[PDB]
Every structure is written in C-alpha cells, then in structure tokens.
C-alpha cells in the first residue's frame, strides 16, 4: 500500500517577485459626463491585480435635507475600461460591477455605508455643514482576482490604461426641494486617485489564459423581449428587470436612509403617513385639500372607511379637542365607481399619547399592512391623469418632504428588488428552447451555489475551476443557426387600480463572453468562436 | 534554483459536457404518511448534483392564531431516501438534513423564514386570510455536492428514484386553541417538486468512489446509554439529547414568532406574563383562581413576597383604581412546606404607565431574572400531579393565549439548545474507552472546525480532503470484539422543584459509516468491513 | 484532444492515522505574574495542533457594578511560548494573537462574549451574586492550524511544553468604586486547561517546513518612530498606534456592555449625561458644583448656549416645578477667555416626560452631536492642571457611576479605532525608502485581502499559497545595509482645546519573521538569513 503523504509537503520555491502598492492620480476630462484616465507605464510592473478607486467627497453646506445613497462609490461609476495600444482589454459597466460586488461585505462598507453618508441630514442656516469630507473606496473587483498573481494582468512591456466614467452627482444624492442642488451641481467634481498591487517579477513565464468579459442588453420600454447576438462562447447568463422612471419626477415620500431593511422602509414610510393621518385638533383639522374626507373618531374610536374598521385612541388629548383620522390620505383608481386603492384602508390600529408641550402625538402601537411596494410608489403616480381621484390629500407641510431619489441600480420594482415581476422565463439558443421555467428556480440556484443574498435569474453553463481549466461554454452552431439568446418573459399580472401597475420596466439580459488573452507583441485579447 | 511559476498556469480541457436545470413532479401516496416519489430516466443525463426541493404552501383563511415554524421547509421533511436499480444509494433523516445544513444562512433563508411566514399571525373572521400563498425551496444537501462535478452522482444507464417523506402538518404549525387545526389538517396537501442539475457529459470516464452515510440511533426515554452496532469504518460520531414532550398537551405559554434571539423569546415570554402580573383595578381584581394572591402595592411601591422584594411603580392611576401585585402567577413544588418555585419572584423592578383611552398599562423598563428555560417550560408541567401547588394562576384570557408546539428538531431541554444537560460523556469502542470528557470540549471542536454556530458533541476521525483521498476512518477489530459504539452520559442534576427537572429526554447518537460506490451494472453501494 | 477528467477523481490512500482530543492540566505559578505550564510528552503522539485553553471564572458575590471586558478570554492572556528541548519553537503575544483570532466570530463567541458576562450586573448586598461561575475557552491559532495534517507540529520524540503567561485580573474587568477590588484580586487565580489534537500516525515521513513569527515592537510614549531591528526576511509588516491610558485613573463615565457597536457607546454615554443634564425641580437644583451653571427653560423651550440653542420640552411637570438645563456639565478650555469644549453644547433638542411615580424624567427624541471619542475621554483628562475650567460640573451620585476600564488591546485613540490618527506613513529598509502614503490604502487592502472588518495598516510581501510553497519575503541586503525596518508617521492634528488632544499614544509596528523547522535530533527553529 503506496500512501500519500498528507503530514509533510515538498515545498515548491516560487518565481521571485516583490509586491508593491501603488497609487496614481489621474487626469478629468468632461452634459459633459466625467472621465477620469489613469495611465501605467513602468518597467519594472510586470503584472498587477486589484484596483481600488479611491474618491474625495467633499463638505456640503447650506439648507435643506441631503444625503447619499448607500455604497456610493459604486454608485457613482458608469463605466470602466482596462486598455492597452491593441485595444480594450476588459470592460464592464457600473451596474454589473456592483452586481459582482454585491456579496463582498468588506468592499460595500467600504465604498460608504454609515450613518454619517447615508442619514438623511437637515441643513437649518445657509452657512450649516451638512455633512463633513469623507473617503471612499471603491473595490474595482476584475477578473485578475481571482487566483492571486496566478490570474495577474502582465504588462508585456505594454502601456497600460484605466479609464472611468462617472454618473452625474444626481445619481448619488438623496435630497428634498430645499436643499440648493442645482449650485451643489455646478460645483461639485470628482478627485479620484487609483491603487493596484503591482508585481516586480524576475524572470517571468508567460503563458496564454482566458477571460470572461460581461455583455449587456437592455430592452425597450415594457417590451418583455431582449436579445444578445453574437453568442459564440458564453459561461453564463442573467435576466433581470429594471424600473423606468422617467415618466416622473422622482420624487418618493420617505427612504430610510442608514437603515436598509424591507422593515425599515415600511417603519420611515408610516412613520411619514402618521402625521397627516391622525390630527389631535381644536375643530376640523384645517390645511388639507378640498378632496380631503376628514372624519371626528368616535367615543368607541372606530371609524369605517367602507368595509374598513380602524382602531384609533390616543391618550392625554384636551378637552376642548378631539382626535380626527384622514380616511383618503393617497387614494387611486381608474374608473370612476369601482374598486379604489386606500392608504387609509391598510390601517387597522392606531394608538399613542398627545404632548402638550410639543402639541403632537406620539405613536405608540400601530397594526397595519403596509408593504415595501407602498414605500416604492413615486408620488407622480398618485396624482397622474389615469387616476379618476386626487390622489394626494396630504398637508402641504408634509409634501414639502418628499425626496428625490436617482439611484442607478435599483432592480425590480421596489427598492428591495423583493416582488418578482417574472412569472415566466423562457431563453432560446437559435430556434431551439434553451431553458424554460415558472418559478424561480434559476435564482435560487444562482443564490446557492454564488452564496449570495442578492441574485438574479442566471443560466450557469460553467461548473468547472476558474482558472486552471478552460471554462465550459455553451457553443455556437452558425450553420444550424445557434448564434443568438433571446430572452422571452411574462410579466406578473398586477391590479389594474394599483398605482405599481404603471411603473415602467427594462428588461436586462447579461452575457459573459469568452475570451482568449495572448502576450504577443503586447497584451491582446481575441473573441473565442 | 529550478522555480514554480506562480505566474501563469497550463490550461486544462475539461471534459466535453453540458448543464442543465431539470424540474420534476411527483407521485404522491399516502396515520397515511405523505410520500412523494420522483423518477429520472433519461439517456442523456450523466450525472447530477444538487437537489432542491419545492413545496407550495396554500392559503390560510380562517380563525385564531397560526403560524409557520422557522425553517418550514426543512422542519416537514422526514426522510430523503435515493435509489436506484440495486437498492438504496444515500438516505438521511429530516433531523440530519437540518443539522448538515444548520450552517447554510441562504439554504434556510430559502427553506422559509420571514416575518410573513413566521409571525403568529390572527385571524379574526372565518373569511380572513392569515397566510397567502407562498412556495419554499428546500436544499438537499448530499455528498455529491462537495467536489461540483468530481463528487456528482454518474448515472450509469440506470434509473434514480427520490422518494421524500412528509413530516404530518402540525409538525410545521404553531397555533391557539381558537384555530381550526381539524379542517385545516384534514384539506392541507403537500404539493412537492424536485429540481437538480443534470449533466449531459461526452465521453466520461467513470471512477470507483466513497461516500459517507449517516445512521441515527436514538435511546430509550431518560436512559443514559445509547449503542450503535456494526461499526466497521466510521468517519465521525455526534452525541445529542432532545426533549420528549409526549407526556405533555405540547401547550407553551409564548413563542417569539420570527424573532429567534434568547432575548427574543424572554422577551415574549415577559410581555406575557405581564398582563396578569401587574393589575391596575378598582377594588380586588377579579377573574382570577381561588389559590391566587393578589396583593395591594403599598405607597413605597414594593411588595415582599417571601425573601423577594419586587418594585412596581405605574403613572396615571386613575384615583379609584389601585395597582394590584400577582404574587404567586406560576407556582411550583413536589413537597408541601419547602422550597417553591415561583414566577412572581423572578421580578425585581415593574414600571409603567397606565392608558386612560385602552384601559391598560404599558410596561416601560423591567427588571427581572427569567431565562430561556423558563420559556421552554410546557403548560403542563405546570399542573402536573406531582405540584403540591395549584400551579397555573393566570387568568382565563391568557390561558386562550397558549400555543401548540410540536417543532421535530428541538434539542436540549430548551428552544435554543442553550442548557447543557450533559455533564459528562464517554464512548466505548467495544469494551475499551475511546473517549472520555467532563466539559464541552468536543463541542467546541466542533464548531471550530465546522465553522457553525450550533455545534453539537462530535468526535471525528477524518482530516484529510474530501473525495481526492480516502477518508480515515475508525476502524473494527472483530476479533477483539471492536465492531459496537457505546455511548454513556451523565446529565446535569437539577433541582427537583423546577418544572423543567421533569421534562423526559432521548439521547441520539449518529455515527456516519463509510460506503465504496461503484458503478459496473449500474449503481451500487458497498459498506465499507 | 486530450481532456482533464473532471467528473471522477484517482483516491489517494493517505497515511495512516488516528485522531484524539487530549486535555492537560497545568501547573501554576507565580507583581507575581500567572503562569501555567502544560508538558505534552507521549510516545504515541506525533504531530499536534489546534491549542484550545479552557478557563474557569469563579462566582462573584457581593456589592458595586461588575462586568468582564468582551472576549475576556483573549484579554487575560500576556504571552503564549511553545518549546522543546532545542528552545522556543514558536510563541506570540496577547495583542497580536488577539489580532489573528480578530476575524474568527466562533473563535471570539467561545471566547466569552454574552450579556451574561458582560453586562454590568449590580450587587446590592454583601451576599449577592454578580456573576455565576463560568468557563471559556481561547482557541490559540498556530501556524501549524492552515493546512490541517500537512502543517501541524511534529514531535520528533521531543517533549513539548506550552508556557501561558496571564495579564493581572484588572485588565479583564470593568467595576465601579463601590465593588471590593482588593479583595476580588487577593482571591482570584486562574484555572486553566490545555487541549489540542494529537494524531498517532503509522510510519511518519517527516519534511521540512516553513514558519512565520510575530515580532512586536512598542515605541516610546508620543514617539512618531518605531524600529524593528535584524530583519532578513519578513512576509509581512503591520503598524498601528495604542492609548497610553498611565496618566490617568483608567475611570471613564460609561461603558456599553454586551452591546458593542458605535451607536451603543455613544447611546450609553448619553444615557448617564441626561440625568445631569436636565433637571426638574422645585426651585434651583440642589447638589450640584458652584461653577454650575444650571439655567432655567424658557416658555419658548430654548436655551442659548453661547451660539448653541438648546430645545427642551419635557411633558406632565408639576406646577410647583421646573425644568432646568445644565449650560456647562463637562467643560474644558486651555486659555482663560477663548474656545471651550462644552458638552452641553453638542444637544440640539431634548425631549420627554415626567414620571410622578418615579420623580424622573424618561427621555423620549434627543437630537446631539455626540461621537466616539466623547465616550472614549478619560475622567481625569477633564480635570487635569492644563483645564483652566472645574471641567466636571456633574452630581455626585453620577460621579461615582464612573467605572474602571483597563482593557489591554484597545487601538487608536477611542474605543472602537474608529478615527485615523495617522496622517501620513513612510517605511524605510535601510535608508531607502520602501513605502510611503497620506491616506490609508494599506489598511484598506489589509481588510480586502484578509475578508477582515478591523484591519491596521499592513504592507504584505507574500502573495504565494500558505504551506505548498516557501513564502516570499522582503530579503535583507546587509552590505547596502538593508537589515533594518524603520516606520515614521505624522499624527493627525488635533485641537488643543479638545481633551483628546492629551490622550497618550504609542505607535506599534509588528513583523513577521521567516523561520527554518528542521526535525532532526528533535524540533528546532533556525532564522533565515
């Protein structure tokens, strides 16, 4: 019986190398979208991997209500190019490098997720200071990760290139009326700085690899079709959908800030409700629109709202007052005498104690069924023309908080991406029928075997070691036609009478292509067919 | 000096395969114990890995309190059982799923767990719904998952069936008296369906391999002693107790619902002990046992009761109405002029302020003793025979409150497995003493080495990789009689006046055998000798 | 084409073995610094690893408030040394193994880390229970853990002993004055046990191997310098800066407990400043300093505060009292008439309500600008001869709430390391130099490449896989005089009106030396030169 030794090992001594860590200020060039270059040009760097974007933010004074959206140095990125003088080397957009990204803890909290970033600040005085310079750092995660200096980019004596597209400063920001954005916009500029770990090899051996390089598709406006053509080499792919905002203002009620719960959201989004919807006043409540159906609670505080029992009593209210419950706040429907969506109606129980020092009421225990889709409604489509009623019978005051809310990489049709839209999916290679499903099991999949929170509906053709092996690929067949995916989806069916219903979607379909990277008069790569 | 490129690397070929995502229906068959069987039979499919389960849970309409459990999906599995033409390949208990699994954050994310599952949901009119409609996924983890590909399942031409066996569905509920659990059981159906990835593979060249196979035995009611025969290749053995609530209405005073931190269930617990601890009334409160003692709170705020001083302090009392102290809520003891066991003195400070508009008081801070054991104690060891003591004080509403809980997968003698009952181990391996311990140490092991958070007693045998070696095993010697695992325990002594002193207990001892998997005439297993 | 199987593998045979938990008393001596010894001579033991220490904490009875630092296990360790008869093979300190363990939350959960023992239980009578008796356990990583079987200690029929030095029990603890230290510390001594896994392996072939050592070096108080002297070959330098807490009494105003995130520091702190803080009272408050200045509440709630405009509105005051508001609670200024820190100043709204019941006010909304290093000031920096102000205008009842803390392992200038105190860093092998930066990007790819959520600033020269390869180190050239590594910073600037400003600092620079292990004529170490 030949064993193998599993107590000792022969150890191998490695080709000599050095690391070192270096940083690079780059040149800005600039509805003028900014571009920041970054220019590698040494002889002793023979490889490098791991790219750090590093971004100064800058103090924010003045008035209003202002805050970033969380990890918004993601947010922030549009594109990113690695090139070199035979062409692009690797790129990605800043959606599918967050995707990739989504699952490294460490690097989201780096790229700024604190309560310091993300609260919701208020400005009193034009001279206030909103929020304080800040540092992030944006992992830049490529596919010279994953193996150490096994996967390395080599610089075969080659300029090497990194260039980074912004998105304008409104995709970061979340802001009320008040705040002066559009001086914030003039003035603000990104300084960015870049840092890679660089490699000093003696005496290097340079083989050819492979590469994966994603590929997006966005569909039309509602259309549930897209397709990537051009499919010759593909390791996998994803289908997801997003949400179109154009047709609004983007304008929301509330956002949660620091707190990113699905319980979060739903606690700011009552929590902004509360104050219109129950009043402690001294007669009927005045300030509201004429649409506005302000009813007195009764001595057994009930009120119904068709069909609809709320529980209100708050404690400690005077005797020359009474407690009045607004029973159409945000009301929607489509035709004139049917079936109406009540923010009212989600409310079962209200209970609290008034303050006669502050002359508000403080809510204790509240029962209702408010869920992340309410919090996800833009306030454009409570008050749009289909909507026989006027929506919106809120206090000017609370109006006056709504939020502008931009943020780029938003997935579904809420701000969780927790309702599915997609009750069927169906994916052909050519003509033929490459995968079908009702359900989403192919999330579920990409969830377990990615150990990921956050996935998508993805197609995995590859099972095989990263970079050890050649990755498997689902291969073209030109003369039977296999040289194209088009995605096919059914959308879920919402209710005519919800606002949800007009929110527009994109479908999103991403595709990793194969590629072969060569040394060869400098660094090359080519499209495997 | 001869050096290893670290730098670059010889791409291998792969194998020529292709995956799929398949999805199967079952054959159900029914105490009538549903069974779901599942059949694969296709040429083209080589080998497969990665088994999950989905189940569609309906709707829940109706009266009373209902819940799901944390983890429905895998609390109401009871067997996996996968097979093929020659018998049995790899079985599991639903138990040792669940604990392979206990690790897995997404895979019991998946399996559901969230408050829309998991909150003690009520209904309040035969029509209302208290769950929607929902679909868990259940991932069955097996040995072929480990090594992707290496490890997977080959079908070599021949037929695998996957038979699931169905836990009885209040296993999986939590729910009150007032809920219609005969209906309810009498119409609910499992309606399962199985997924895998299947591999379409050109030209496989198929390997001899080993697998390992876990056998659950369990000890007779409170005996010490547990001993699993046939042993001839093990690679670990586990030791762990479970509560035996057969003698029991498996009734329990609170459940924390989604919440399943220690915290969360005291807490649970406390709120509600609290509606009958602390009374604010005009005159003596009524509705309550003759045997209850209901005490004045005098004007220094604290009330004696017997060594105990607790501290109760309520604003707002109304100037007819007192505050009213509960002294002996849950009362135990087994002699009649000794040491009691009494809820009301795990109390030491009680403040809160009374609500003229709900009539009730709201509990602001509390100071208090209670632990998880507490929480775990069962309604009917309140009132057993062996209480000198009318045990259970509390009023009839509160006694409408209690719920059913028959969870399959409880260990220790509490919720959260926290009480080590097991004082001191030993295990024989034939007559010799294999291992002996006072203290947790295997457990700690354990769960350095499994990297977990719910370890159990475990000692294993094999260090070396998985499927690229052999695994180690402890090995038989029939003729010094080494073939048999005996494991003796002794418990923690409790205190004969605490209710959780009479909880019966099962000790379960799995050891997992060492199988070859070969694949001339299709596939077969041999254990290991 | 020839192609790498990857759906079976050729199961090597590996060497025969047998694995055991052993557990080892120790033998205890002894400012008289605690040491145990545990001597592991066993003929039938060959190869060794993962040291696991077990620690009994007794019962603590008494009066005060009494609490164990997080991770108190970890804390109460000073140095680790494992020798043979060749001398020391390997050891480390306290901090830096603390350091290692830093991302292992099982390792730090056994370590003790439950509100049960670091919650700060109140004694209130000579007899009562603080704390029950518990045991730890401090999982000691060794380099001879990465690898399993390949890198673990062999004992080439040597005897190995295992040296634990322990810190003095005041480091562990954290007490107020009314606690009986000096009798808690004549009674206490530690009681420890070894454990690790022993391997009797049949026909051992014996290699060999690589190890990494820590060494330390602590620079002098306020220093901006540090060197390591005799360096040959490093993989890896860290740098970090320590408060030096020795010019003070160690009290500070709160510590959080069991809770240790940011938002529970500051939250504790606030909580013990707003009983001074806002007063209700009947007439001017009583028992307070004469300088003072306690300021009765305006109708209008606001109180002006030298620029700052403090919002107070407390509900149900009596009508014989007043609410009052503490202008100068902890002050502190450096010149007579010009900048003050005011911690009153940093409230911007305060409210609540007055319990009759309880004579208190309970808090509700408080609006501050309280940080991090407001909780981390030390008591004595508030009164110190520089402070041309009474800096602690507080009662007395809250001055003796102030608790002793002299946790070991604190980095940075506050409790969390949250602020960044060095400004700019340069490193220097030899005179040259090796690294320089202003921001922390060393620290951010320290936590990157080690997945770590509280990395230093770390230059790592090795990039090669653990045990399979001989690690790359940075090489001494002691003819250019390269045989020396010394790190300069530059502090971050403070105010000088602020107390940090005062707080003591020592920079701390550790390296990881490359050592030889030779087996023959037992174990040995030799440095690579």
Redesign the interface.
């Known amino acids: 019986?030949?064993?193998?030794?599993?107590?000792?090992?022969?150890?191998?001594?490695?080709?000599?190398?050095?690391?070192?860590?270096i940083?690079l200020s780059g040149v800005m060039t600039n509805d003028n979208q900014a571009i920041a270059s970054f220019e590698i040009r040494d002889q002793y760097i023979?490889?490098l991997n791991?790219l750090?974007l590093?971004l100064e933010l800058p103090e924010v004074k003045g008035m209003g209500r202002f805050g970033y959206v969380p990890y918004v140095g993601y947010k922030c990125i549009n594109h990113v190019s690695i090139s070199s003088c035979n062409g692009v080397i690797w790129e990605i957009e800043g959606e599918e490098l967050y995707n990739n990204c989504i699952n490294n803890t460490?690097?989201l909290?780096?790229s700024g997720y604190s309560?310091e970033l993300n609260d919701i600040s208020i400005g009193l005085t034009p001279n206030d200071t909103i929020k304080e310079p800040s540092?992030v750092?944006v992992?830049i995660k490529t596919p010279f990760d994953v193996?150490?200096?096994?996967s390395?980019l080599?610089l075969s004596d080659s300029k090497i290139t990194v260039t980074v597209t912004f998105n304008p400063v409104s995709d970061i920001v979340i802001r009320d009326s008040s705040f002066d954005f559009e001086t914030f916009n003039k003035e603000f500029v990104y300084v960015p700085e870049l840092?890679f770990?660089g490699?000093m090899?003696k005496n290097?051996?340079?083989?050819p690899?492979?590469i994966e390089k994603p590929r997006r598709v966005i569909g039309q406006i509602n259309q549930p079709t897209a397709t990537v053509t051009e499919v010759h080499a593909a390791t996998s792919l994803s289908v997801y959908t997003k949400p179109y905002y154009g047709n609004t203002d983007n304008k929301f009620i509330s956002y949660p800030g620091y707190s990113q719960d699905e319980?979060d959201y739903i606690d700011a989004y009552v929590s902004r409700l509360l104050d219109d919807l129950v009043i402690v006043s001294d007669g009927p409540p005045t300030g509201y629109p004429e649409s506005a159906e302000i009813v007195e609670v009764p001595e057994d505080?009930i009120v119904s709202i068709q069909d609809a029992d709320v529980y209100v009593?708050?404690?400690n209210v005077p005797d020359n007052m009474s407690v009045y419950l607004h029973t159409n706040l945000l009301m929607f429907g489509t035709r004139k005498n049917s079936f109406i969506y009540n923010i009212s109606k989600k409310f079962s129980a209200i209970?609290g104690?008034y303050?006669?020092?502050?002359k508000r009421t403080?809510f204790?225990h509240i029962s209702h069924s408010i869920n992340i889709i309410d919090t996800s409604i833009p306030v454009s489509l409570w008050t749009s023309q289909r909507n026989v009623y006027n929506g919106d019978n809120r206090s000017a005051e609370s109006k006056a908080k709504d939020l502008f809310i931009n943020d780029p990489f938003i997935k579904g049709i809420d701000f969780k991406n927790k309702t599915d839209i997609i009750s069927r999916l169906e994916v052909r290679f050519g003509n033929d029928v490459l995968?079908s499903?009702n359900?989403p099991?192919?999330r579920?999949?990409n969830?377990?075997?990615t150990?990921?929170?956050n996935g998508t509906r993805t197609?995995?053709?590859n099972?095989?070691p990263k970079?050890?092996?050649?990755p498997?690929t689902?291969t073209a067949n030109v003369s039977r036609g296999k040289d194209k995916l088009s995605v096919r989806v059914v959308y879920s069916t919402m209710d005519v009478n919800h606002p949800i219903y007009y929110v527009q979607k994109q479908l999103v379909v991403v595709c990793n292509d194969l590629y072969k990277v060569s040394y060869d008069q400098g660094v090359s790569i080519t499209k495997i067919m």
Chains 1, 2, 3 share one sequence.
């Not at 970079?467 to 050649?470: A, E, S, V």
């Open positions: 019986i030949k064993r193998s030794n599993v107590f000792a090992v022969d150890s191998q001594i490695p080709t000599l190398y050095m690391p070192q860590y940083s023979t490889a791991h750090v590093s460490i690097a909290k780096h309560s540092t750092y992992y193996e150490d200096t096994f390395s080599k840092s770990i490699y090899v290097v051996q340079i083989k690899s492979f319980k505080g009593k708050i404690d209970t104690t303050s006669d020092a502050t403080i204790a995968y499903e359900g099991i192919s579920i999949y969830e377990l075997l150990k990921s929170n197609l995995t053709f099972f095989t970079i050890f092996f050649r498997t689902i």
